[PDB]
């Protein structure tokens, strides 16, 4: 069924591809994911808009809005993408998670470091357990009878 | 996630020096009355608008406590309507049914190569 | 740590330094009911109850039957934003 | 469920290396082959629907 994708392909510009754009106001730029050819300009002609991406948001968590019924359809047509694009789509579950830099087999020291961090989090939990039994908003110390408030978050 | 990474923070009396303020009451000290309707629109409205429809922030996702996985039943969507009215008596025939797809002389389905209209969804 | 001068406070709540090319500021939020305007009272009545009203006309002019014996016909055209219990039954069964 | 499941991650690591190629290349080529299978699955599903 390659006949159905003929129009999409452009001889002058090139084959279709998926990338991002840079638009908005100076100082508050936001990424916009669209579909275009290879030689097309970064900000110009576009075939279809897939979504957007906001790496900086007031809440502090990166947002990502995408179309689940369009990305899968475009991939079947034979549309490539950059390395960075694959990583973001992998987390969403649309495509297999690509390997990180230097591969996975070399990730030897990180495995041990991650275990230490996980162990510390579990140990910290045990510490706070006892606190709830004798929670004291106001706790002094044997220095100058100074007041020290305690609050969780 | 906030409840998981819990910590004990000790706050002394001297750390709340800047928290206090002099004025008792508070209110808006600058009216929101726009001066230039066109100059402001093409400087702080158009660049920040990339969609042709007005969509509000969706509700948060609900997850379990023990297993920490998303649940099946959750809150529904939050559709928005202009002026409250949500009724159309003579809906037009939109072209969004077959995005980038048309019918050939043979009857088969073929694609197109055209720039989408920025105000396609804003012109019902 | 005690905050005495403004210099100490400035060097304690500021965000960590970042690169000059990457974006630093966030993206402001624009509500559907206010794009480039912020309505507010500018008169004597500056503090009073201002309830939101959502007009809702008839959904269909055809005569609908009673769902499980409970009538779901429209009685009056005046409807507030809050959903009435009678209407909540019809929408619940629709899904 | 296989490509999108946890089995895909461990499959890339268990691959035979070749002389003259970097460790990252072995996993990259293995991942590329997997990406070819998903395209056919989506294409078949879209046509059927």
């Amino acid at each position: 069924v390659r006949h159905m994708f003929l129009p999409f392909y452009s001889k002058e510009r090139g084959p279709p591809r998926i990338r991002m754009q840079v638009a908005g106001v100076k100082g508050k730029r936001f990424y916009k994911i669209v579909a275009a050819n290879q030689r097309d300009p970064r900000d110009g002609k576009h075939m279809e808009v897939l979504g957007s991406y906001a790496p900086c948001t007031p809440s502090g968590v990166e947002e990502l809005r995408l179309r689940f019924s369009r990305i899968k359809f475009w991939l079947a047509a034979g549309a490539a993408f950059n390395s960075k694009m694959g990583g973001l789509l992998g987390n969403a579950g649309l495509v297999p998670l690509p390997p990180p830099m230097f591969g996975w087999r070399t990730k030897a020291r990180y495995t041990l470091l991650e275990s230490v961090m996980q162990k510390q989090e579990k140990l910290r939990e045990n510490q706070l357990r006892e606190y709830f039994k004798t929670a004291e908003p106001v706790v002094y110390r044997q220095v100058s009878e100074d007041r020290d408030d305690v609050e969780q978050e | 996630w906030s409840q998981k990474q819990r910590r004990l923070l000790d706050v002394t009396d001297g750390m709340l020096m800047f928290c206090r303020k002099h004025t008792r009451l508070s209110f808006k000290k600058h009216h929101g009355v726009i001066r230039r309707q066109k100059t402001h629109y093409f400087s702080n409205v158009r660049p920040f608008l990339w969609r042709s429809s007005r969509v509000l922030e969706p509700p948060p996702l609900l997850l379990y406590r023990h297993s920490g996985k998303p649940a099946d039943w959750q809150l529904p969507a939050r559709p928005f309507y202009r002026q409250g009215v949500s009724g159309l008596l003579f809906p037009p025939r939109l072209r969004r049914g077959f995005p980038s797809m048309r019918v050939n002389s043979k009857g088969q389905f073929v694609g197109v190569n055209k720039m989408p209209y920025i105000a396609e969804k804003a012109q019902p | 740590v005690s905050f005495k001068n403004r210099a100490e406070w400035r060097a304690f709540m500021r965000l960590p330094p970042k690169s000059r090319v990457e974006p630093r500021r966030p993206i402001p939020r624009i509500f559907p009911w206010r794009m480039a305007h912020n309505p507010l009272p500018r008169r004597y009545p500056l503090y009073k109850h201002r309830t939101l009203f959502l007009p809702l006309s008839l959904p269909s002019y055809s005569p609908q039957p009673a769902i499980s014996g409970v009538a779901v016909a429209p009685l009056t055209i005046t409807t507030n934003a809050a959903q009435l219990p009678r209407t909540l039954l019809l929408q619940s069964a629709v899904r | 469920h296989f490509l999108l499941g946890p089995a895909a991650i461990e499959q890339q690591k268990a691959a035979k290396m070749q002389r003259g190629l970097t460790p990252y290349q072995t996993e990259l080529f293995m991942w590329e082959r997997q990406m070819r299978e998903i395209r056919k699955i989506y294409r078949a599903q879209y046509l059927q629907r």
């Binding site: 689940f68 019924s69 969403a92 579950g93 649309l94 | 998303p70 099946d72 529904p76 969507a77 559709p79 | 929408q91 629709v94 899904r95 | 469920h1 999108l4």
Partner: peptide
């Protein structure tokens, strides 16, 4: 039952919204 894949869960919401609008 017990849709674990992200794609399966994403499509579930689409059907629910369309069903409400259908009369």
């Amino acid at each position: 039952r017990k849709l674990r894949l992200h794609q399966e869960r994403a499509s579930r919401g689409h059907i629910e919204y369309l069903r409400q609008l259908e009369r």
